[PDB]
Amino acid sequence: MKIGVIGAGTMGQGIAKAFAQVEGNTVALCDIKQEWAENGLAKIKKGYEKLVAKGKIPQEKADAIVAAITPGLKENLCADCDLIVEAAFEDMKVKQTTFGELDKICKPECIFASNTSSLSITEIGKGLSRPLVGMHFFNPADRMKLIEVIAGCNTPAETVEKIKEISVAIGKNPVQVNEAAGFVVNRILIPMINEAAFIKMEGVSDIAGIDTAMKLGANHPMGPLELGDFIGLDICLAIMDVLYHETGDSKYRACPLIRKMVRGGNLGCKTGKGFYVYNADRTKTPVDQ
Amino acid sequence: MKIGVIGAGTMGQGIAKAFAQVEGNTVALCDIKQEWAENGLAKIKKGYEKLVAKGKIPQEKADAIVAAITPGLKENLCADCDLIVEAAFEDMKVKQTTFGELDKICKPECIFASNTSSLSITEIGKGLSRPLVGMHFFNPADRMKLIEVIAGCNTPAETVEKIKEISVAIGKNPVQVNEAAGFVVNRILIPMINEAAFIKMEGVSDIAGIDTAMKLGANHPMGPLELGDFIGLDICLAIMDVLYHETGDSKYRACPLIRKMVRGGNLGCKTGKGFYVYNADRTKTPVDQ
Amino acid sequence: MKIGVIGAGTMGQGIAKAFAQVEGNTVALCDIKQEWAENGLAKIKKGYEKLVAKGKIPQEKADAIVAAITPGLKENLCADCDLIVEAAFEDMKVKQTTFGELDKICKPECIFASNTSSLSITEIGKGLSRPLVGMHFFNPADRMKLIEVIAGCNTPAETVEKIKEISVAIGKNPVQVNEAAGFVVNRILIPMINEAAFIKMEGVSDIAGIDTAMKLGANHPMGPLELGDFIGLDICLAIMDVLYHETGDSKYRACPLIRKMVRGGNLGCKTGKGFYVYNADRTKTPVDQ
Amino acid sequence: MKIGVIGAGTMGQGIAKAFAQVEGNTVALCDIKQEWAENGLAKIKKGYEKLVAKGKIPQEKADAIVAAITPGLKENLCADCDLIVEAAFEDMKVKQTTFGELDKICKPECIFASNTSSLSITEIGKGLSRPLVGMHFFNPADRMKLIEVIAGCNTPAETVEKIKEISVAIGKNPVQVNEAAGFVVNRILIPMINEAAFIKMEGVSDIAGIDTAMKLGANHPMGPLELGDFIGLDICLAIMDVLYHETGDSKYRACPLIRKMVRGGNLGCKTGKGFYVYNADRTKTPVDQ
Amino acid sequence: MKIGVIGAGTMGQGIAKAFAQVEGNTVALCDIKQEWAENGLAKIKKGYEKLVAKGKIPQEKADAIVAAITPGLKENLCADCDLIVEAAFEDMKVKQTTFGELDKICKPECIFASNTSSLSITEIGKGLSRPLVGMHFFNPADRMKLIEVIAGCNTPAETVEKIKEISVAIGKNPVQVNEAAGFVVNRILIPMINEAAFIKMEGVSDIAGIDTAMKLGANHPMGPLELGDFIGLDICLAIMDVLYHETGDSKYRACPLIRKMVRGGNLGCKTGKGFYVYNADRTKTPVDQ
Amino acid sequence: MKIGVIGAGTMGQGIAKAFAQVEGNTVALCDIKQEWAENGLAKIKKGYEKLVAKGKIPQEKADAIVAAITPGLKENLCADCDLIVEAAFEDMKVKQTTFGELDKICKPECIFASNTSSLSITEIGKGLSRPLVGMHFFNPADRMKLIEVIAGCNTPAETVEKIKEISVAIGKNPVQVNEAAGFVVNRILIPMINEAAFIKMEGVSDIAGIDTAMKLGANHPMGPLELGDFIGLDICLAIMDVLYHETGDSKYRACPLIRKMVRGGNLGCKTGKGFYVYNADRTKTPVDQ
Ligand SMILES: NC(=O)c1ccc[n+]([C@@H]2O[C@H](COP(=O)([O-])OP(=O)(O)OC[C@H]3O[C@@H](n4cnc5c(N)ncnc54)[C@H](O)[C@@H]3O)[C@@H](O)[C@H]2O)c1
Ligand SMILES: NC(=O)c1ccc[n+]([C@@H]2O[C@H](COP(=O)([O-])OP(=O)(O)OC[C@H]3O[C@@H](n4cnc5c(N)ncnc54)[C@H](O)[C@@H]3O)[C@@H](O)[C@H]2O)c1
Ligand SMILES: NC(=O)c1ccc[n+]([C@@H]2O[C@H](COP(=O)([O-])OP(=O)(O)OC[C@H]3O[C@@H](n4cnc5c(N)ncnc54)[C@H](O)[C@@H]3O)[C@@H](O)[C@H]2O)c1
Ligand SMILES: NC(=O)c1ccc[n+]([C@@H]2O[C@H](COP(=O)([O-])OP(=O)(O)OC[C@H]3O[C@@H](n4cnc5c(N)ncnc54)[C@H](O)[C@@H]3O)[C@@H](O)[C@H]2O)c1
Ligand SMILES: NC(=O)c1ccc[n+]([C@@H]2O[C@H](COP(=O)([O-])OP(=O)(O)OC[C@H]3O[C@@H](n4cnc5c(N)ncnc54)[C@H](O)[C@@H]3O)[C@@H](O)[C@H]2O)c1
Ligand SMILES: NC(=O)c1ccc[n+]([C@@H]2O[C@H](COP(=O)([O-])OP(=O)(O)OC[C@H]3O[C@@H](n4cnc5c(N)ncnc54)[C@H](O)[C@@H]3O)[C@@H](O)[C@H]2O)c1
């Protein structure tokens, strides 16, 4: 009911879908400007009718979700609608600038969670009139079932359990984690991608060989270079850079190959080229040749 | 072709099975003592008709397979083989002595391959005449389809691809690796386990929560703390120390909590207690609770 | 001699008292506004009125010390001063703005000194027409006998000696420091407290355990965690980051637990909460239980 | 109760005094040879007569304290003892074989404790039939009030509790320390001295300056360089090496200046030259001038 | 060939001379306005005549190289160019916008190039209509023969080879560099200078000794401490910090002594004082006595 | 003056040549066995068929150099030597024993010098009746004109000044060094080669391009990879390890490529294969093609 999704990108669309999938949620997909928001809802819709083509979901529910999602600026969001899940740029200032009113133009009745993957939950919510909590999704947010619950330094446990019940009543498994850089999943998962980059940069193996070896030798559903393309390399570099800045530990130095690629605009799937090139045939070719 | 397997342990049997399921590839499964190569051999037979008993093999092959493997010790079986996949104690001097002995035994066109994980392939065959290559199987070597081919500093390109051709001929998917500590799999997988222990020691979450987070948010079949008990925490601590000694990079410094548990005999599954207590009724209780 | 103390705060007051406590030393206590300056003086007087009523100083000298301190702002009273000791905000351009403005106001023979602890003496006085030196007092400056004489890159040895002589002229012991981060005391004392936070965060011991251990085993007047809240965790955090940034050495990486508390506004005694909760009944409870 | 003190050295003598100081406590002071155990008792009795002649302890109690300590060998005396504190050479295999001996001579209900400060108490007692705990006394043990209770990986919470009861009973303050290198005091105090050496090596300040800065700017009873000369630079270097090897963290790297002095035999007070030259005139002169 | 050299500073003048030293070459020397753009040509002409005065080039060629250069503004002169080489302020946003203009002023087949020492070629050319490549010159650019060719993340192999051909066509030896921090020379040379400062700061050897040790022990033409002053200590400090920030590796931490000198304006030859005081008599004197 | 050079290897012969080519210098080239002492003199006199068959020197003085070097072993020749220069195996245990009896054999006014590049001068001369000082030559000692005078902990400055006196007498340039790992040249030069290896391993540039870039870009007479092969990659790897284990800083970690090549016996010029393949035709070829 009146769920607030700020950010209409890779995962704002997934959280919008994950909430609008169930009974009634009437979800609010907002972005920087109006057309970028409906561009994200259009991608949600084209996916939904590409998924009735293969008959994995009926046609009536596909638009019941798309019609429950209202695109736009924060002008449908900020009528004190409900619990709000920010999915904006992985940058401390932008995550706290927007939250300067998502507590305010909403009634302080509401719950203000952030889907940040490494940032400090406490510093995001440093001056708002009500707690800021962390609800952490994983892409695709409609398929994956884990929700990382992160309590702020002085965030009351009232907010933490009311959001644990929200995820339970959506088919998700809530697990509470104490606030630290990259919490639990990303602090373990992202350096795996960072290490595969180092392995390729230092000529240990090729791109396809790194991803095959992690899939057959460790039974992983996707290799780390594949996984970095799916997440988005700009996000991967931002998470690695937060871990380094917070800890001061060179254990988390981002591999220079990834920063070179992110500077080149090759962020993976969302840009059409990562460690692999994404051809129109829905096929995937390693950049190594 | 005839293949020797120096060592009849977990990897000695596993590799022998992978070399027995196809054709007139006769394996000489050796060990230090004949009492044990048959012990080894006896263990493989039991697991076969553990599964002949389950309508999934015909025993006409589960017998032609076990008949192809002949047990003994190196000198009285290994004069007429074309490939030696040694899998012995992970010690630099036992493998150097071994290949120093088999060099004066085997055919002068028999290929010498090592199944080591943490030792330098180049240093193994430094005193030998014929090239030494890396052939890294994965537990269990019968069904695991990945083989890391390790090219040493002086491993000719010819030797590498013949191992790559033997690997495809036995259904395995090979990958070429230029010698570096932890090649690909263990260089990514083991620091992942190491980072999970840092999560626990720093109190970011509990043992169960870390494991469940990694199978629900990253789709991993086993949790990292789970896997560390399976592989063996002594094996993981040794690999982290190899990566740290080889590179000098404090990025691969082993977690002090893991070093504490190894000195306590709590090596995981093979000792009854690891990160989880392995009770008699098979319940897996985290030592945290 | 006449001395101009720029800044009428905690250290400006203590430095004004340290100089006027002598005899031929008169002080010019300056601040942002005049009312903010004679504010600082009014508190210096109230202190000396209490020290009189306890029988630990006569009234006639408490009168004489206060009579030697004249409030106001600079430009009006710092033209004849022989020594300038700034006690302004820990901000580079603030001290640069201030020292450049006094460069025209003070007579050529006026020595310029700064009280900073984390800012580079050499950089503060870059464009100044005269040398700049460091005079590091320790709170409370009127009773603490140590003064660090910080020599800059272009601080002439003679300027160093004139600070040495004035320091002995007021009963203090001057210790010369060649400009480095954390000079001598902070570079040793703050990584001490920083180590205590790492010990607590990694579950080595409890808060009450660490502090009483450091005062019983090392005979220290205060535990490090206690001392952290007393100096202010924001101050200790900024010092570690200055150490880390200047040297680039991960040895001085700030403990994430301290950075978490500073984000939550828990800075210690000055906010009621720290490693200890400073209760209204003036007791002090470890936050561990 | 009866307390077997193993090792009649500096710490064993003080620990024997710290126990025989209480009324109902009997001490067995053992060593390698019987005569060596009696020489240690002769020295504590000598220090007691020097205390009676100075009127700080009546002659009645010194004779009672001395009569509670009986020297000898491991088997003859330690059979019927309730607690065992070992104070032997800081050698992993020395302490390992000693506790294995007592595991067959000491009664089952006897408690096994070690005075080690650099070795892993988990590893010390890995093969014993009973738990091991750490009881880290402080020199001089007869008047130092701290006791560090070291809980290993398999030290039960019950054993930690009874060690704290005995410590409170003999007038000491227990502090539970979960096993980590340098526990609490040494992990904080030794890097402090190590930092002071770095400050001198980099020419920040001279020797006497650093020490007087720490006693006047931090209210410490002794300067860090002074403290190292009193502890012994060989031990301070050994501690830093343990911290560096157990963590793998460049943060705990020893100052090369210290290692150069240790190689030169300038270990401080016990050699007559450290950071200070210790003349026969009871004076102390820094190497700097 | 027509070459547009954007930036009339120290390297812009030399790079313009390296191209006009050859014969079918026209050079446009651009700046922000036109006066200082013609000034840059005036500094060149004055440098050129002092060579004809000593007898090192005839007036026939000195004037002819001057005539091949045209000062002015970018739009007026660069629409008909075949190569662009920017030598502007080492600032990422500045270089990003000038190539945005040139992307629509220059003809389709014109080749862009950047002389940057410390900024990512990939990022400079993120959204251009044509590839961006690095052409690193070395000061003095008209006689030094090395030209580092930097391949960005998206720089085609063809455009790099065209730059290679342009290098030999003007008398230079090109070397291909896949973009990394410091490319090749600065990544090796600057940490060499940095290490010399570390050797000095820690009291290993004197300034005069370190230099003579490197020129006589390694047969270098200059010592590392005098080379740093020749380059400029601010330049060297900026290279070490870009290396440190790009790699996140503490291996490239800048020597605090170099940082202190830059803050004090002791930048080397260009300021008359570095590790050596460059004298009236044009002879150098170490600051070490 | 008469000198005793202990050792007949490359540096033993080289220091013997460097001394015997002045005039009043007589050398006692002592080794472990006489026959190998005449070995060194033979290689000296064999190579000296390239100074008179080249006729630079007249055999009036071209055998007065080979006549000044007298073979034999230690105890029979060094009873009255003016200076001792050991060049034995780079092993701490061997050198102390060597100087241990030279102490009793040589006259009291004999100066003890050592040529070690990695071992600690202070530790070698700990238990001696006279100070030991470092005299570090550079291969080839006859042509290289630098001498690193290494002052140990207990080495007097007076003893340093006479090593400087002797160095000028033989035409060399002494530089005083205070004992530190890798002194000055190796601390700067070997990390150069180490960084060049990292550049190759990380795919930044090829072996040939890296070398010409350092020759043409920094005016170095040799490339850094070239110099590693010339110095010997085993000695280069040993220095980095010595630099790493002494400082404890991961700044000095050895490149894994170098460690790989050393394990493969590809040490450079003295084995025929390094970073270049050294042809008998006196040319070389990079291993990159
Ligand atoms: N990429 C992942 O797999 C995932 C992992 C878990 C956490 N999330 C977190 O979600 C956040 C969003 O990143 P993403 O993965 O969706 O990639 P993304 O960059 O494509 O999505 C970001 C979206 O937010 C929009 N946006 C930016 N600023 C905004 C503002 N002020 N107001 C409204 N909208 C704004 C952007 O236009 C963009 O559409 C990240 O910060 C990340 O921490 C990332
Ligand atoms: N999952 C794993 O354990 C992992 C997987 C990849 C490869 N690695 C490597 O494979 C190799 C085999 O290890 P494992 O898992 O089988 O442990 P293991 O101890 O069970 O196997 C050792 C076997 O080799 C025998 N052996 C020892 N020395 C011998 C000798 N000199 N000659 C002949 N036989 C000898 C032993 O008797 C024993 O049977 C190891 O080097 C290991 O590093 C194992
Ligand atoms: N125990 C300590 O507080 C510690 C001790 C050593 C020195 N340091 C340094 O001493 C200096 C004094 O800090 P503080 O502890 O007194 O905090 P404070 O806030 O109490 O003192 C700051 C005072 O300086 C005034 N001020 C600001 N700008 C001014 C200006 N341009 N001209 C005149 N006055 C100005 C402010 O109005 C304020 O009253 C700081 O730089 C601090 O880093 C303080
Ligand atoms: N200031 C300190 O001395 C410091 C304080 C904290 C604890 N530590 C630890 O205390 C323990 C002892 O320190 P110390 O200074 O007294 O050593 P020490 O050299 O002064 O004397 C040790 C005594 O133990 C005896 N001993 C050795 N092995 C023995 C054995 N197998 N059986 C019986 N006796 C044996 C020795 O004969 C010797 O008398 C060490 O583990 C040390 O790390 C000492
Ligand atoms: N020896 C060296 O200094 C070193 C050598 C190799 C290359 N690097 C790189 O060369 C480049 C230039 O270095 P420099 O020595 O000339 O410093 P510089 O400051 O002297 O050059 C700046 C010149 O370029 C002009 N300029 C600035 N912005 C401009 C713009 N937007 N358009 C046109 N002109 C502009 C300025 O007016 C000025 O004349 C830098 O990127 C530097 O990193 C310099
Ligand atoms: N580029 C270099 O070679 C480098 C340069 C500076 C000095 N260093 C140091 O110079 C010393 C000599 O180096 P090297 O290359 O000539 O070694 P080497 O391998 O050439 O042989 C060492 C020589 O010393 C002899 N020797 C060994 N032990 C002896 C002993 N106990 N008594 C007498 N003679 C003994 C040996 O017989 C042999 O002749 C080493 O310590 C080395 O680290 C060498």
Author numbering:
A (entry chain D), B (entry chain C), C (entry chain A), D (entry chain B), E (entry chain E), F (entry chain F): 1 to 289
Per the authors:
The A2HBD has elevated expression in F. prausnitzii A2-165 and is crucial for the transformation of acetoacetyl-CoA to 3-hydroxybutyryl-CoA in the butyrate cycle. The monomeric structure of A2HBD consists of two domains, N-terminal and C-terminal, with cofactor binding occurring at the N-terminal domain, while the C-terminal domain facilitates dimerization. The A2HBD protein exists as a hexamer in solution.
To ascertain the binding mode of NAD+, we determined the 2.55Å resolution crystal structure of A2HBD in complex with NAD+ cofactor. In the structural analysis of the NAD+ complex derived from crystallography within the P21 space group, it was observed that all subunits comprising the hexameric assembly were found to bind to NAD+. By superposing the NAD-bound form of A2HBD with the apo-enzyme, we observed that the monomer structure of the NAD complex is similar to the apo-enzyme structure, displaying a root-mean-square deviation of 0.543Å. Like other NAD-dependent dehydrogenase enzymes, the NAD+ cofactor binds to the Rossmann fold domain without forming significant interactions with the C-terminal domain. Observing the binding mode of the NAD cofactor, adenine moiety of NAD cofactor is somewhat exposed to the surface of the enzyme, and the ribose and nicotinamide portion fitted into the deep cleft facing the acetyl group of the substrate. The phosphate moiety of the NAD cofactor resides within the G-x-G-x-x-G motif, composed of Gly7-Ala8-Gly9-Thr10-Met11-Gly12, situated between the initial β strand and the first α a helix within the Rossmann fold domain. The NAD cofactor is captured by the enzyme’s Thr10 and Met11 main-chain nitrogen atoms, establishing hydrogen bonds with the hydroxyl group of the phosphate moiety. Hydrogen bonding interactions involving Asp31, Glu90, Lys95, Asn115, and Ser117, along with hydrophobic interactions with Met11 and Phe138, contribute to the stabilization of the NAD cofactor’s two ribose rings and nicotinamide moiety. The hydrophobic pit accommodates the adenine moiety, fostering interactions with hydrophobic residues such as Ile6, Ile32, Ala88, Phe,89, Val94, and Thr98; thus contributing to the stabilization of the adenine phosphate. When comparing the catalytic triad′s conformational changes from the open to closed conformations, it becomes evident that in the NAD+ complex, characterized by an open conformation, the catalytic triad resides within a hydrogen bonding distance from each other, thereby contributing to the stabilization of these critical residues.
